Design a binder for this molecule. Structure first.
Ligand code: LMT
Ligand code: LMT
Ligand code: LMT
Ligand code: LMT
Ligand code: LMT
Ligand code: RET
Ligand code: RET
Ligand code: RET
Ligand code: RET
Ligand code: RET
Lengths: 283, 283, 283, 283, 283
């Protein structure tokens, strides 16, 4: 059964204006997130700098992706009558999300594990498996949604969506097992924060398949609009909310190292207005 | 009753030149503001770094928005005879302000509360309510002014403007109550500065509805010009003036922490040519 | 009496090539100036950081303006025969200077006063008056040269030029009075440098009205070329020369504070190969 | 015997979408790599800063190259029927890789030798030979693949490929001999890491000739797609994997200098979650 | 006698591909150089920061120039048959080098004198003369090669080339005399490095007139190609090689100041793998 792809639908003026807003809102929010990451990078010790590196990468690639999509949007539809009619570049308002996710979901996995308590073979095993799984979930998604059948084949979307779902399950299990093993080896305060942060990333992941199901089941300007609103909103919530959460844990673990004498930090660490550690200098 | 949207009016050469100037002036002013924020970020302690983060975000998003609009302006009107006639891109000289405001008004709320005395559940309750309220005021504004009716429906502008006004009131009350609760718990010097800063943000907010009322009541090149001049000028005044004001309070509270022994700061803090605290090092 | 605006003249290949060179030379020089400002920002104490902020802003806004103009130049003339014929974008090779000046002349005023000895009501009174005066001089200039009459009305150029000249006089007097009051309260070395720097900014200002007089009196490709050469050259000389000069005074006043025990500085300060203060640390 | 160049093939929608994805994925990955390099630059002592400089250069040049290629891709094919047909810009989706490699392979050579134990005339001799050899391998490759015969001559591809292969062998031998001489003069831990890193760069180099052989042997959209996938994937693996590996060795050698008293480092160095050296200050 | 300018020649596919490569190679190399300058700026004391400022400027202006030229190249030729035929933008693939040189040759002069031992009136006299001479050599070159006669007049090229040659001689003599006077007042190690560096800049300068002589004597695609290859290659060699050389001298003079007690430096200075000074702190 053939369906029409999301980038094939003509848009009303309302829909065209809504999509522009959500794309530009997301790009802007992500650029704020990038700046936040840069400005707060010194709050975290060198032992937990991977958290900052991972988050910087998420914010940079996501920003670039949305900037590309906003420009593609301006060039991918032509006003004809009262409708905006998609040209051959309209696909570049949807496909670049798959590029973003191909990097960002693996980097999220790395960010989450950066503040967990794993080392040795297990650490490397877990990080590789989780990165690989995360990449494959997005890539198989991209094949169904964009490449095989040109986004128009229900069978292709279903098959590749199911494959993507398997990699989702695998990655999730690998990450959840890692966190579960770490929580006993963390301080109560960190353990609690890490558990909460883990629910937010997994739960945030469940929103994205919903846009894929729309592509399978419904076509039209309203549905294209819905896809962009759902994915823009998920991108904002996941890439500001979650990133803030790991930063807090990295700060807390830094401060615990300072108080334990494991390391020193050049500035005081404040979390929710409360001082967690004092500024210090090497002897 | 149908009206014509602001981006539908033909412009005289004078009007076209004035709008270009104001858009480019605002973009430039905001880019200066961004640089100022970056250069002065080390004047504030880690306890008050949210002020800098919030302000950086305002300046980055606003700058991008105006750069986009200046480019849209160059492509959204065609010189025909002695008039500049808007094409289908002219709406991108108005609509991106709603993107900017959708981030900046929530970030202003965060900036103001960053230097207040809250913490606890109330802090999170207040920050979320104020962010949500602020976002909804702009978004409902965007629906009336751009989306529902295509900016041409008086009824839609009135209804959505009224809804936006309710969210304005709510956000204002939430913020004013927070400040009022904080002022007794601040030092007199900070309390006085914080009260003044609060009047400037609320008062600055009242200018923006005036451009919305123009869209409702008057159409033509002169009115489009007026809208852009009012909104550009408000953007400049609010995003340079207010941001400077919170930075001063964050500096003053930093210096008070240094003198109280609550924290140390790597450089001396100067405010209006007077030294507030000395440079210090961890023991 | 009608005249032709500068952006209306056809250019010979020689003139077109000269203008490109001067615009690109100025943009490049200003981008160097920006980099210089960033690289030398730590040579100045926090008490005089406004000098660096002001100068950063001048360099960023001026650079952006010239980059815009160089791109506008490439799109605002079409090679037809042996002539370059201006299209409707040619005005964007002249008008953006008014945007630049609208920010830069106020920021110059702020830079000059940043190293003077004023505080209290007078300080704020002077800074506001000088900023306001400076902005109005440029804005009234822009109205005569670009907006009212489309740059083609001699009467409009004369009237608005005279108004701009009044604001020039006012701003100059306000600044000169401030400097004159400061010089007795500075050390001889700084006083001497500040007096010299003040003559360079005022004298540099007198070049700009000459380009305005050309617009009034002469039209043609040679005159358009002359306007661009004069304004490009003035921009280079004023925005590299003067900025260097205030930086030196800020360095000298920093070093005098270090030697007086008023503050400490993390590095040694060198001025013209001679060490002015040693690197120090907080007790 | 004439063949068709890779940029001459028409692409199906699937192929066009795959190439876009891989180009954008590589550009994004490399931009992450650049950010990583900048954020982790302070983990390495000044004695080994060449490693960071070399790696920064690889990441900046590669990113720029891919950004250029992604934009070229959007302009170098036109949708005609169900095919994307290459225009005269399509060659700019292949040729810029040769620019990237012309800098990056010499910089990789420099990065590898940056952490080796070699100095004096031999050091300069080795660095020059390896840089020269590396540059010539790419340049002779570019001549066969792009310039002589316009990418369409089998004889030219074979001859210039063979020449490029000779320079490959020479560069490899020079580098391997340098590493082999260094390994005895390093600590066991560093020696082991350096040996591993050396295999990864040489092995990574062997992938690239495979894309050249495709150009010789097979033409069509599938083959163009294959070339881009292989080269994008190799670029990602070599420019994220190898660069991480030298950074670790530079960190380890830094930490060994700190523990030996040869130098001090401002922060603690952590490698795989284990502390290698403490933060220190000059006496 | 009329000749054809370099930007008037049609290019074969081979020539077009070679020029693209060299322009993109140079832009990329210079962007690496910029990054190198930024990453190594803290290796030099404040007494010698002019070296870093000068070099930063060379690298920023040169990079921008080549980026402009690469984009101009993509738009300045049209594929027609088997030839690339220049349009009216092709001149922007040659003329921007004159902009770059107009800043970079004066900045090279400043860089060389930054590490010499001249000071007082002589210092300012020398720096002004050398900057002025350097600027005039390039500007008179630009007049002959681009402006007067449109690059087509042999007489104009000869006359203005001769004038440019006089300014070359003057600038060279001024610089050589300064170095010669400095060498006795430097330590042997620095004196030797400074003498070598001086030969490299003067010798590097002699390559550029050769491209000018081609323009006079030969016209065609091969000659245009030759001009771009010679000038690109000279730009790479002069703006990476020489800049590295002054940085080393600035590092060595910094280290000598540290060992003499003239100043302190925050990190150790390493030159060719050997430690020259230890990291220190203010007493
Ligand atoms: C296709 C897209 C796939 C994307 C995958 C990206 C993989 C790389 C992720 C980052 O890679 C990771 O970076 C951090 C950077 O701190 C390094 O971590 C290292 O440095 C930090 C300090 O900075 C130390 O605290 C840490 O103990 C040490 O192992 C890791 O050794 C490296 O593996
Ligand atoms: C729709 C668009 C709405 C956009 C809103 C986006 C902003 C919301 C999040 C604000 O981001 C806010 O950043 C500051 C960064 O200093 C964090 O604050 C944290 O770090 C600072 C700085 O060390 C500490 O002083 C502070 O005590 C600690 O709580 C907040 O915990 C986080 O909530
Ligand atoms: C239309 C366009 C007009 C543009 C005009 C812009 C005017 C404001 C720009 C300068 O604004 C000025 O910034 C400096 C930044 O150091 C602040 O100055 C403050 O911080 C510095 C340190 O950084 C202290 O030494 C100083 O004592 C303190 O007052 C001023 O309080 C603020 O008023
Ligand atoms: C065609 C394209 C080819 C590109 C090749 C470019 C080669 C030059 C780039 C590397 O150039 C190299 O930079 C490092 C930068 O640290 C310098 O290295 C110098 O500084 C570092 C500190 O930064 C010291 O630890 C080192 O001992 C010292 O020699 C080298 O002296 C220089 O030769
Ligand atoms: C056509 C346009 C060509 C323009 C060429 C450039 C013009 C000359 C620019 C020279 O800019 C030069 O910058 C350095 C920056 O360190 C300043 O130098 C000053 O600061 C440094 C520290 O930073 C001190 O070591 C030095 O003793 C002091 O004089 C010079 O005083 C200034 O003259
Ligand atoms: C910041 C971006 C994030 C976290 C993106 C997440 C995306 C997914 C979790 C996607 C999952 C999918 C499936 C499980 C089924 C097929 C469709 C996908 C790719 C959307
Ligand atoms: C820096 C940007 C700021 C502070 C923008 C503020 C915008 C508003 C306060 C807008 C308010 C509106 C209403 C209250 C009703 C009419 C619609 C709006 C959105 C203009
Ligand atoms: C860096 C830019 C500077 C210092 C620009 C200065 C511009 C002026 C001083 C302009 C003055 C003018 C008049 C006094 C008369 C009318 C025309 C003006 C605007 C050029
Ligand atoms: C990061 C980029 C890298 C490491 C690129 C490497 C490229 C090569 C090793 C290319 C080698 C080639 C040959 C040995 C034969 C001819 C074709 C070449 C240029 C691909
Ligand atoms: C980094 C750029 C450099 C060092 C450029 C140097 C250019 C010259 C030395 C040019 C000299 C010329 C003459 C002496 C004769 C006329 C032609 C010129 C301008 C190329």
């Amino acid at each position: 059964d053939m369906i029409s792809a999301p980038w094939e639908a003509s848009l009303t003026q309302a829909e065209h204006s809504l999509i522009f807003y959500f794309l530009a809102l997301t790009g802007s929010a992500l650029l704020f997130g990038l700046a936040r990451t840069w400005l707060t990078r010194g709050e975290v010790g060198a032992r937990y700098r991977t958290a900052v590196v991972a988050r910087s990468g998420i914010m940079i690639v996501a920003t670039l992706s949305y900037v590309f999509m906003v420009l593609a949007f301006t060039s991918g539809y032509d006003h004809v009558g009262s409708l905006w009619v998609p040209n051959s570049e309209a696909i570049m308002t949807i496909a670049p999300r798959y590029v973003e996710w191909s990097i960002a979901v693996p980097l999220l996995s790395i960010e989450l594990l950066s503040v967990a308590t794993l080392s040795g073979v297990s650490a490397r095993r877990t990080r590789l498996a989780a990165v690989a799984g995360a990449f494959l979930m997005i890539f198989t998604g991209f094949l169904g949604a964009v490449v095989i059948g040109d986004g128009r084949s229900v069978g292709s979307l279903i098959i590749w969506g199911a494959i993507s779902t398997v990699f989702w399950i695998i990655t999730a299990v690998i990450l959840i097992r890692a966190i579960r093993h770490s929580l006993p080896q963390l301080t109560p305060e960190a353990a609690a924060l890490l558990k909460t942060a883990t629910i937010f990333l997994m739960s945030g992941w469940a929103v994205y398949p919903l846009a894929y199901l729309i592509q399978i089941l419904f076509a039209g300007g309203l549905w294209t609009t819905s896809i962009h609103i759902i994915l823009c909103t998920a991108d904002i919530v996941v890439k500001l909310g979650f990133c803030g959460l790991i930063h807090r844990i990295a700060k807390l673990r830094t401060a615990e190292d300072v108080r334990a004498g494991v390391d020193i930090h050049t500035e005081a660490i404040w979390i929710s207005s409360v001082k967690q550690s004092d500024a210090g200098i090497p002897t």
